[PDB]
């Protein structure tokens, strides 16, 4: 039951925020609807969910067109998958957020392809904080340079950081890795304008990420099933 699962997930978010002295409103729930049908999204919308994350461009754009066509207003779509240059125009024309900026050329393409009448595309720079197997994300040492370049792109808005840590079962390591991101986020936030988003945490490490300072958790399985 999607409605029931949304309520249950929001309950555990709220508790984890309150337990570590944070307001529940500090945490945005991003419902990851990738691989799920539009009808499952429509259920979530009827249950009050408004922010959806998609991993594949054409799948996401098709859904966005579907709900725009029903005149369903007020949604926020986040592209959270790796972005190839040949699909950037579709992202730039349809999505509200992109979490996976890890090279300047893809950001400049998105900026150039973003219609001027739209709001600037909110972007996060993706950090490979702990996954030796992943091709995605930059090293932290590259952050200052990339953030500076991205920040001048007028049709993008740099909002913060994202990371997909390597899978980790120990709470202690989940926390310390998320803290590495939170420290980097805080340092960016002191010099850059409108840094307010740390996209960090999924179903299995949600509590450590929230304790560490995440502002946005990306939940799929716990809402829609795997
Ligand atoms: C970036 C990102 N966030 C979240 C998820 C899903 O998280 P979970 O199903 O563990 O809640 C995935 C896709 O599986 C993902 O690629």
UniProtKB/TrEMBL annotation:
The modification N6-(pyridoxal phosphate)lysine is found at residue 34. Keywords: Pyridoxal phosphate. It holds the Pfam family Ala_racemase_N. Residues 5-226 form the Alanine racemase N-terminal domain. One of its GO terms (molecular function) is pyridoxal phosphate binding. PROSITE patterns: UPF0001. The keyword ATP-binding does not apply. Its cofactor is pyridoxal 5'-phosphate. It comes from the Bacteria. Belongs to the pyridoxal phosphate-binding protein YggS/PROSC family. NCBIfam families: YggS family pyridoxal phosphate-dependent enzyme. HAMAP family: PLP_homeostasis (MF_02087). Monomer. Pyridoxal 5'-phosphate (PLP)-binding protein, which is involved in PLP homeostasis. This is Pyridoxal phosphate homeostasis protein. The gene is yggS.
